[PDB]
Design a protein around this ligand. Structure first.
Ligand SMILES: [Mg+2]
Ligand SMILES: [Mg+2]
Ligand SMILES: [Mg+2]
Ligand SMILES: [Mg+2]
Ligand SMILES: [Zn+2]
Lengths: 295, 148, 166, 246, 110, 289, 46, 153
RNA sequence: CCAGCCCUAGAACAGGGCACA
C-alpha cells in the first residue's frame, strides 16, 4: 500500500498504544499484591505492590538505587523477567546482575537487546525508495563472538556490500541511538493483533505465526523502545544507555533457494563489563568472522 | 548618584499629546482632620479652592475625607495605575495649591533620572551613517589588490 | 536562638485540582548543637550538595571526617521521616536540594599560653540543615560550549547602540 | 570561662508526686468499653431485607435484660430519656462530628466527641486535608445495647449506648502537599460500624459524646492505598544468621 | 611576623573554596555481593570482616579456655569443629576445638 | 524599655512594608477599594477624553456577561429574588459588535486613503494588528477602562478587556457622530503605529516572492540581486550589501551578515519602497478638518 | 550516572588473565618479528 | 634524599623498630592471624617470610635456633614454629602469608589498617576478593577466543 | 585510561612502571 515509513511508524505506535490502553483498562481497580524478596542480600523483604502497575524497577526503587543501577534482569519465582513489565500476582522476586555466578540469562537478554537495537538501526538507516525487511533475531549463544540480525534488502541492492565507511556510519547511528536513553517496554499481545500491527513484513508474519504455534494461548511478546517495535524471545534490558561499547563488525550475505539475506553482525559490551582497548580490538576481530547457528 | 538609583528613557504614556491631550491625573484623594491644628491648611483649601480646581479640571475625581488622622495626606492615582502619596502637613493654602497643580500637571511616571532629554522615533531621516555611505565604488567592485 | 527550619515542615498546601501536575514532596530536617566545626561541616555539606541520597550515603560511609557519621545519621533519620510521616513512596527517590551548616551557641574557656598570658578558647557548635526533595536528581550544569559563547558574543555585539547620538 | 549549658529536656514521672496531688484527676468519660457487643456474622445478608432486620433488632434489644435494666437506670437517673428519639440525635451528632473534623473546628469537635475519641480521630489527620460528605443512608441506625458503669468510690455513673450504623459516605484524604492519597471524593462507598456513645449521668449537663467505634471482625478490608508500601527485612547482627519462616 | 590588614571575605572564600581543598568524590564504591553492604574495590567488606572477627574471637576464646596456662601452646596442628561433626581420619592426631554453634555458611569444611 | 510611640509606630509601618515585600497580595479591585464612586468615575471618564458620551450607554457598555453570570450565581447561592433588575442589565454584546465593525471599517478606509499601494492582505494584517488583543488591552489599561469594567476575574483577561473597549467604542458611535468617533479612533489607536514598521506586524514569509509578484503586477520584468559592497569574506562576522537592479536600475539595497539574509533585506526594502511605507514617508496628519 | 573506575584485571578471570597476557605477548613478538626486516619490504631511497 | 632504601622508619629508632617488629612477629606466630597498621604489616611480611625460611631449615641448625630465640619472645612458640608451621610448609616456596587491607579503624585516628595471616590456619576464611566467574560476558568471549586459538593449532 | 601495588619520581599535588620473570 501507499504508506510512508513515518506513517507506518505512527500507525504502529498508535496501535501499540491502543493495545496498551486496553491492557491497562482490563483491570479497573488497583489490587494489592504481596511480593517477597527471595534475594541473597536482604531476605524476608515484603512489598505491597499494585497489580499490573508496579514493576520490578519500582521494587528496586523501593530497595535502593544500587539495585536500580546494578540489577538488569528479574526472576519472578520461576522465570526471567524484564524491569519494565508489570507484575500479575503475588510471587517472589530475585534480581540478577552481570557479575553473578549464573549470569547466562542476563547475558542472553543483553544479546537480544543489542540484536534488536542493531535491527532498528539497520531498518531506519536506509533510503525510503529501497525496501528493507527484518526477518528475526538469530538466537546465538554467548560463546559466539557477535550478535547477528537477518535483513532482506531490495533486489537491486544484492550486488554491493557495505564498506568500512558504511560500517562506521552504522556504528555512529547506534551510538547516537544509545546516547538518548530509551526504555524497553514489553507487552503480551495476540497474533490476531500482531498480524495487523506489522501487516507488511511477510517474514515477520511467518515468525509471529511460528512463535504462536508453540504457544497454546497464541501469546506473542512484543518489544518496543522509542518509536520502534519488534518481536523477540525472552525479556530485554531495562535501559538502552547500559550498552556502553557498541560496534558493527561486518555483514555476511547468505544465499538460499528462495532469497538472499544479509546477516549483520555486531559486538557490544555494557558499562558494567567494559573492556580494554586491545581486548575490544581482539573481540571485534573475532566477531569479524562468520556466525552460523539456527537450531 | 545615577549608578545607585534607577533610570528610564523619556517616554509618554499612550503617546499622549499627539492626537489629543489627556490629563494623566485620574483621581486626587485628600485625607485630613477637622480639629487637628496640622490640618489647618488642608481645611482652608477644601473650604476655598477645591471647587475652582474641580471646575477647572473635570477629568479628575476629587475625594475629600475628614477622619481622625494626625497627618494630612494627599494620594494621586494616575491613568497608568501609579499611586503618588504626598504630605500636606502644616502647609499654607498657596503651597497646597502649588502641590495640587504639580500633581495635576505630572504624568504619573516614576521620578528618577532621565538618560536622554529627547526621544525621537525613527531619527534616520534621509539615511543613517554606515561605513560605506561615503566611500566611492570601483569598477566591478574589485578589492584593492585583486586582479580580474 | 531561632527555630524555623523545623517549623517549615508543618506547612499545609491546598489540594491539587484534577489536571495539575504532581508537586514533589519536600522534607526539611536539621541537627542542632553538633560538636563539629562550622567550616568542617560545611565542607561535607558542599560535598553532598545536589547529589542523590544513595550516593551521598555511599560517600559519607567512606569519608574520614568525624561529621560523616553525623550527617549519615541525619540523612537516615530524614529518610525515615519522609517515608513514615510524609506520603513519599520509593524511599530511594530523594535528592538533597539544600544542605547547609551554620554556627550556634559557643562556650568560652581559658587557654593558657605562658608568661601569665591567656586566650579565650571557643568551644564551637554547628547546626546542620538538610532539605530532601522527592524525585530524580537534577542534571549537572555542563560548561558553556564554543557555540553558546559565539551566540552570546554575537548577541552582545548586536545589542549595541549609538550612545550620545540623538 | 566557667559557663555551662542549660535547658536539658527530660521526661520522668514519679509515683510520689503522682500520689501527692492535691486534687484528684477529674475525668469526663471512662477509660474504655466494658461490655463489647459481639454481632452475629449474618447481618451482611440480613440487611438485604428491611423487616427481617428491624424485627430481629427489636427482639434483641427487648429480650436483653441487661439493656433493659440499664435503660431503666438511665431513666430513673434523668427524666426525658426516650429510646425512640435517640437514633436521630446520634446520627446528627455523628454527621456534625464528621463535618467538624472536615472544617478543622477543634473546639466544636471537643464539644461533640469525647476525650477518648478525639485523639484517635485527630492524631494522624491533623496534617491532612479531608473532604467528607453525606449522601445517603441505606439502613437507619439501630440501637443494639445499653450498658452502664457505676463506680461507687466516687458515685459516678457513665452510660454507654451502642448503635449499629450503616452509612453511605465519601472519603478523600489528601496530603500536606495537596496530592490525593487515600481515595476519590465522588465514590459513595458503603460502610457499617457500631458507634458507642457515652454520657455521664451524674453530671448536670450531660452532653451525649461519641466514645467508641467498633467494627465487626468479618468486615471487608478497607480500600487499597494509592501508593506502594515496602516492609523492611529483619535487621540482623553480623554474628547472627537468617531464619526463613515456612 | 604580623598581618598588616584584615583579609576580606571575598579573598577568604577564594582561598577556602578552591577545588584543591574541597573533598573529592570517591568513585571506587561498590556493594558486597554476599551481604549487600557497601565496600571499596580494594578493601574487604566491613560486615563480612566483622563476622569473621567475631567468629575468630569466639574460636580463640575457646582455644584459650582449653589451655589453662598462658605459655601452654599447642605443639601440633589444630582443627575447629562445630556441633554435628566428628573428627575424620585426616583430623585425628591434632588438637580439637568443639563449638556448640552450628558450622556457618561461609566456613568451609576442607 | 525606651519610652516612646513614634519609633514604635514607624517600626510597625516598616514591618508592614517588609511583609508587603515578602508576600505580595493579589491585586484587589479598584472599586472594592475604599475611595470609589461609580457615577463620578463614569463622568470623569466621559470628560477626560473631551467627549460627550451618554451615561446610560456607558453603563450598558461597562457591564459584562461574566459579571452577570457571577451575580446570578451569587443570587442563587444566597436565595433572594433578583429577577426584577438584575435581568435588565442589557449586556454589551451588540455594542461590542458595532464597535468592532465600525473600527475595522474605519481603519481599513484610513489605510486605503493613506497608503494606496497597500495590498488587501497587508491592510487586513494592519487592521488586525491595531485591533489585536495586545494593542487594545494596552490602550484600555492606559485609559483605565479596566478599573471601570464591571466583571469578575479582576485581572480582566484580554478577550473581556477587548470586548469592553469595543463596547465603549460602540457607545461612543451611538452617542456622538461617526466623524467624531473616527477622530477618537485616529487619536487613540493609530498612535500605536508611530515608529513601528510594516513587516514587524505583517510577518510575511517569502519577501522576494511577494516582490516579484508586485513587479509582475506593476509590469516590471525581473529584479537582479548583485553584490554592491562587502567587508570581509573569510571573517567570523561577514558584512554584505545586496542590491536589486531592474533594467540595470537600482531600486533597493540591503545589508546583511550573509548574502541570503542581505538579499532578503534588500527585497524587504524594495517591497516597502513599492508600498510607500518608508521611513521618509509623510507623517500622519493629526489635525481637525 | 556515576560510572566507576575500571582496570583490565577487575572483570577478568583466573583462566583468562594468563590467556590475555600470552595473547598480547605473542602479538608483540610477531609484530617485532615482522618489523625485523625493513630493507626488503619497502625502504625509502637512500 | 631517600633514594634506594628498603626499610621504613618506625618507633623511636632502629632498635625500637626491631623490637616492634619482634612483638608483631611473636603475635603473628602465636595467633596465626593478626591485624595492625598497614605499614607495620607490610614491613612484617618479609620478616615473617624469612622466619618461615629459617624454621624450615631444621631443628638442629643452631643459627636458626638462636634466631628464633631472639625473635620469638614467648619461648612456647619455638617448638610450635619448628613442628607445626615449618613442617606444613614444605612444597610452598614463598606463598606463606596473606595480607589484606581492612576498612579504617573506627577510632578517631582513622589509620590504614591491614591483616596478615599464615596460610593453612585453623581460622574462618577471610572474605577474599575473588575473580568473576567464567560465565560472565567478557570471560565467555575470552573463552571463545581461546577455543578459536586452540582450534587454529 | 588512570581503581589499587612499586619507583633510582616525589612535602601534598604531579611523573614513570605493573606481559614475558
Ligand atoms: Mg607562672
Ligand atoms: Mg576568637
Ligand atoms: Mg581576638
Ligand atoms: Mg601514571
Ligand atoms: Zn559483605
Amino acid at each position: 500500500s501507499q504508506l510512508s515509513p513515518t506513517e507506518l511508524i505512527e500507525m504502529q505506535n498508535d496501535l501499540f498504544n491502543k493495545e496498551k490502553n486496553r491492557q491497562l483498562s482490563l483491570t479497573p481497580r488497583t489490587e494489592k499484591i504481596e511480593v517477597k524478596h527471595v534475594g541473597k542480600t536482604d531476605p524476608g523483604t515484603v512489598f505491597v505492590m499494585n497489580k499490573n502497575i508496579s514493576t520490578p524497577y519500582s521494587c528496586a526503587m523501593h530497595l535502593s538505587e544500587w539495585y536500580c543501577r546494578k540489577s538488569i534482569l528479574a526472576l519472578v519465582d520461576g522465570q526471567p523477567w524484564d524491569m519494565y513489565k508489570p507484575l500479575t500476582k503475588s510471587c517472589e522476586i530475585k534480581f540478577l546482575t552481570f557479575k553473578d555466578d549464573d549470569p547466562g540469562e542476563v547475558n542472553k537478554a543483553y544479546w537480544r537487546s543489542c540484536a534488536m537495537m542493531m535491527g532498528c538501526v539497520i531498518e531506519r538507516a536506509f533510503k525510503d525508495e529501497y525496501v528493507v525487511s527484518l526477518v528475526r533475531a538469530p538466537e546465538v549463544p554467548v560463546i559466539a563472538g557477535a550478535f547477528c540480525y537477518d535483513v532482506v534488502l531490495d533486489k537491486r541492492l544484492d550486488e554491493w556490500m557495505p564498506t568500512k565507511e558504511n560500517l562506521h556510519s552504522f556504528t555512529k547511528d547506534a551510538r547516537a541511538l544509545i546516547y538518548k536513553d530509551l526504555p524497553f517496554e514489553t507487552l503480551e499481545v495476540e497474533a490476531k493483533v500482531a498480524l495487523e500491527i506489522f501487516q507488511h513484513n511477510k517474514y515477520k508474519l511467518d515468525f509471529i505465526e511460528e512463535k504462536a504455534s508453540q504457544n497454546p494461548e497464541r501469546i506473542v511478546k512484543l518489544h518496543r523502545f522509542g518509536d520502534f517495535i519488534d518481536v523477540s524471545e525472552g525479556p530485554l534490558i531495562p535501559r538502552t544507555s547500559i550498552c556502553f561499547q557498541y560496534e558493527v563488525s561486518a555483514v555476511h550475505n547468505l544465499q538460499t533457494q528462495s532469497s538472499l539475506v544479509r546477516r549483520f553482525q555486531g559486538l557490544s559490551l555494557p558499562v558494567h563489563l567494559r573492556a580494554h582497548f586491545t581486548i575490544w580490538n581482539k573481540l571485534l576481530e573475532r566477531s569479524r568472522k562468520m556466525v552460523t547457528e539456527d537450531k | 548618584t545615577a549608578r545607585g538609583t534607577a533610570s528610564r528613557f523619556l517616554t509618554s504614556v499612550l503617546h499622549n499629546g499627539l492626537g489629543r491631550y489627556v490629563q494623566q491625573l485620574q483621581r486626587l484623594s485628600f485625607s485630613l482632620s477637622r480639629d487637628a491644628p496640622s490640618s489647618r491648611g488642608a481645611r482652608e483649601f477644601v473650604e476655598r479652592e477645591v471647587t475652582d480646581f474641580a471646575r477647572r479640571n473635570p477629568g479628575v475625581v476629587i475625594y475629600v475625607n475628614p477622619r481622625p488622622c494626625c497627618v494630612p495626606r494627599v494620594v494621586a492615582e494616575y491613568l497608568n495605575g501609579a499611586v503618588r502619596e504626598e504630605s500636606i502637613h502644616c502647609k499654607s493654602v498657596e503651597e497646597i495649591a502649588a502641590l495640587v497643580q504639580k500633581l495635576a500637571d505630572q504624568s504619573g511616571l516614576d521620578v528618577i533620572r532621565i538618560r536622554k532629554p529627547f526621544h525621537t522615533d525613527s531619527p534616520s531621516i534621509q539615511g543613517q551613517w554606515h561605513p560605506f555611505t561615503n566611500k566611492p565604488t570601483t569598477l566591478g567592485g574589485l578589492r584593492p589588490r585583486e586582479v580580474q | 536562638i531561632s527555630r524555623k527550619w523545623e517549623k517549615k515542615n508543618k506547612i499545609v498546601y491546598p489540594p491539587q485540582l484534577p489536571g495539575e501536575p504532581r508537586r514533589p514532596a519536600e522534607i526539611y530536617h536539621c541537627r542542632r548543637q553538633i560538636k563539629y566545626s562550622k567550616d568542617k561541616m560545611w565542607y561535607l555539606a558542599k560535598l553532598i550538595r545536589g547529589m542523590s541520597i544513595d550516593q551521598a550515603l555511599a560517600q559519607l560511609e567512606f569519608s574520614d571526617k568525624k561529621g560523616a557519621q553525623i550527617i549519615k545519621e541525619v540523612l537516615l533519620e530524614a529518610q525515615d521521616m519522609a517515608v513514615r510521616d510524609h506520603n513519599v513512596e520509593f524511599r530511594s527517590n530523594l535528592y538533597v536540594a539544600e544542605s547547609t551548616s551554620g554556627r550556634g551557641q559557643y562556650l568560652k574557656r581559658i587557654r593558657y599560653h605562658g608568661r601569665g598570658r591567656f586566650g579565650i578558647m571557643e568551644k564551637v557548635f554547628c547546626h546542620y540543615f538538610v532539605k530532601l526533595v522527592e524525585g530524580p536528581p537534577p542534571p549537572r550544569e555542563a560548561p558553556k560550549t564554543a557555540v553558546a559563547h559565539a551566540r552570546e558574543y554575537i548577541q552582545e555585539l548586536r545589542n549595541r547602540t549609538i550612545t550620545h547620538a540623538l | 570561662s566557667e559557663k555551662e549549658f542549660v535547658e536539658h529536656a527530660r521526661k520522668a514521672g514519679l509515683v510520689i508526686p503522682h500520689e501527692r496531688l492535691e486534687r484528684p484527676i477529674h475525668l469526663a468519660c471512662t477509660a474504655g468499653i466494658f461490655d463489647a457487643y459481639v454481632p452475629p456474622e449474618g447481618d451482611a445478608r440480613i440487611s438485604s431485607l428491611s423487616k427481617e432486620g428491624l424485627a430481629q433488632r427489636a427482639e434483641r434489644l427487648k429480650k436483653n435484660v441487661a439493656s433493659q435494666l440499664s435503660i431503666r437506670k438511665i431513666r430513673e437517673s434523668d427524666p426525658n430519656f426516650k429510646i425512640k428519639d435517640f437514633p436521630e440525635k446520634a446520627k446528627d451528632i455523628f454527621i456534625e462530628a464528621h463535618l467538624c473534623l472536615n472544617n478543622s473546628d477543634h473546639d466544636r469537635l471537643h464539644t461533640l466527641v469525647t476525650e477518648n475519641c478525639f485523639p484517635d480521630m485527630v492524631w494522624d489527620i491533623r496534617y491532612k486535608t479531608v473532604r467528607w460528605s453525606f449522601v445517603e443512608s441505606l439502613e437507619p441506625p439501630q440501637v443494639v445495647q445499653v450498658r452502664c458503669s457505676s463506680l461507687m468510690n466516687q458515685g459516678n455513673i457513665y452510660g454507654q449506648v451502642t448503635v449499629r450504623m450503616h452509612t453511605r459516605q465519601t472519603l478523600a484524604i489528601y496530603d500536606r502537599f495537596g496530592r490525593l492519597m487515600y481515595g476519590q471524593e465522588d465514590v459513595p462507598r458503603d460502610v457499617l460500624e457500631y458507634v458507642v456513645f457515652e454520657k455521664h449521668l451524674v453530671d448536670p449537663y450531660g452532653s451525649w459524646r461519641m466514645h467508641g467505634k467498633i467494627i465487626p471482625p468479618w468486615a471487608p478490608p478497607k480500600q487499597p492505598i494509592l501508593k506502594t508500601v515496602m516492609i523492611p527485612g529483619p535487621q540482623l547482627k553480623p554474628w547472627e544468621e537468617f531464619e526463613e519462616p515456612q | 611576623a604580623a598581618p598588616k590588614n584584615r583579609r576580606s571575605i571575598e579573598v577568604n572564600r577564594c582561598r577556602r573554596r578552591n577545588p584543591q581543598k574541597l573533598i573529592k568524590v570517591k568513585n571506587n564504591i561498590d556493594v558486597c555481593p554476599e551481604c549487600g553492604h557497601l565496600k571499596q574495590k580494594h578493601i574487604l567488606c566491613g560486615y563480612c570482616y566483622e563476622k569473621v572477627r567475631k567468629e575468630t574471637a569466639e574460636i580463640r576464646r575457646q582455644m584459650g579456655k582449653q589451655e589453662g596456662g598462658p605459655f601452654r601452646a599447642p605443639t601440633t596442628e589444630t582443627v575447629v569443629l562445630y556441633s554435628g561433626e566428628t573428627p575424620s581420619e585426616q583430623d585425628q592426631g591434632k588438637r580439637i576445638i568443639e563449638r556448640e554453634r552450628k558450622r556457618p555458611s561461609w566456613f568451609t569444611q576442607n | 524599655a525606651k519610652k516612646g510611640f513614634r519609633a514604635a509606630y514607624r517600626f510597625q509601618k516598616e514591618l508592614e512594608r517588609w511583609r508587603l515585600l515578602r508576600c505580595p497580595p493579589p491585586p484587589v479591585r479598584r472599586s472594592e477599594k475604599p475611595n470609589w464612586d461609580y457615577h463620578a468615575e463614569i463622568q470623569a471618564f466621559g470628560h477626560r477624553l473631551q467627549e460627550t458620551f451618554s451615561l446610560d450607554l456607558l453603563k450598558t457598555a461597562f457591564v459584562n456577561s461574566c459579571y452577570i453570570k457571577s451575580e446570578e450565581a451569587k443570587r442563587q447561592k444566597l436565595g433572594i429574588d433578583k429577577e426584577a433588575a438584575l435581568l435588565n442589565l442589557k449586556d454589551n454584546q451588540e455594542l461590542s459588535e458595532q464597535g468592532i465593525s465600525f473600527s475595522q471599517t474605519c481603519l481599513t478606509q484610513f489605510f486605503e486613503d493613506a497608503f494606496p499601494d497597500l495590498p488587501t492582505e497587508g491592510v487586513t494584517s494592519l487592521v488586525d494588528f491595531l485591533t489585536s488583543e495586545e494593542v487594545v488591552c494596552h490602550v484600555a489599561r492606559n485609559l483605565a477602562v479596566e478599573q471601570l469594567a464591571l466583571s469578575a476575574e479582576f485581572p480582566v483577561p484580554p478577550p473581556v478587556l477587548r470586548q469592553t473597549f469595543f463596547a465603549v467604542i460602540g457607545a461612543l458611535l451611538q452617542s456622538s457622530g461617526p466623524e467624531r468617533t473616527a477622530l477618537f479612533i485616529r487619536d487613540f489607536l493609530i498612535t500605536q503605529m508611530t515608529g513601528k514598521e510594516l513587516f514587524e506586524m505583517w510577518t510575511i514569509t517569502n519577501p522576494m516572492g511577494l516582490l516579484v509578484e508586485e513587479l509582475k503586477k506593476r509590469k516590471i520584468s525581473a529584479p537582479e540581486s548583485r553584490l554592491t559592497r562587502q567587508s570581509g569574506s573569510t571573517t567570523a562576522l561577514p558584512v554584505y550589501f545586496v542590491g536589486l537592479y531592474c533594467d540595470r536600475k537600482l531600486i533597493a539595497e540591503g545589508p546583511g551578515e550573509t548574502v541570503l539574509v542581505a538579499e532578503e533585506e534588500a527585497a524587504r526594502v524594495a517591497l516597502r519602497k513599492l508600498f510607500g511605507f518608508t521611513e521618509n514617508r509623510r507623517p500622519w496628519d493629526y489635525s481637525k478638518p | 550516572h556515576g560510572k566507576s573506575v575500571t582496570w583490565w584485571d577487575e572483570h577478568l578471570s583466573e583462566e583468562n588473565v594468563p590467556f590475555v597476557k600470552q595473547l598480547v605477548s605473542d602479538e608483540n613478538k610477531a609484530q617485532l618479528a615482522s618489523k625485523l626486516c625493513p630493507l626488503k619490504d619497502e625502504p625509502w631511497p637512500i | 634524599i631517600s633514594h634506594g632504601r628498603v626499610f621504613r622508619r618506625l618507633g623511636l629508632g632502629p632498635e625500637s623498630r626491631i623490637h616492634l617488629l619482634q612483638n608483631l612477629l611473636t603475635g603473628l606466630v602465636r595467633h596465626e592471624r593478626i591485624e595492625a597498621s598497614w605499614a607495620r604489616v607490610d614491613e612484617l611480611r618479609g620478616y615473617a617470610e624469612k622466619l618461615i625460611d629459617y624454621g624450615k631449615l631444621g631443628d638442629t641448625n643452631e643459627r636458626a635456633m638462636r634466631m628464633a630465640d631472639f625473635w620469638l619472645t614467648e619461648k612456647d612458640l619455638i617448638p610450635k614454629l619448628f613442628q607445626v608451621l615449618a613442617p606444613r610448609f614444605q612444597g610452598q616456596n614463598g606463598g606463606y602469608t596473606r595480607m589484606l587491607q581492612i576498612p579504617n579503624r573506627n577510632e578517631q585516628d582513622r589509620a590504614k589498617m591491614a591483616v596478615i595471616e599464615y596460610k593453612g590456619n585453623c581460622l574462618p576464611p577471610l572474605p577474599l576478593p575473588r575473580r568473576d566467574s567464567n560465565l560472565t560476558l567478557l570471560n565467555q568471549l575470552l573463552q571463545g577466543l581461546r577455543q578459536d586459538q586452540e582450534a587454529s593449532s
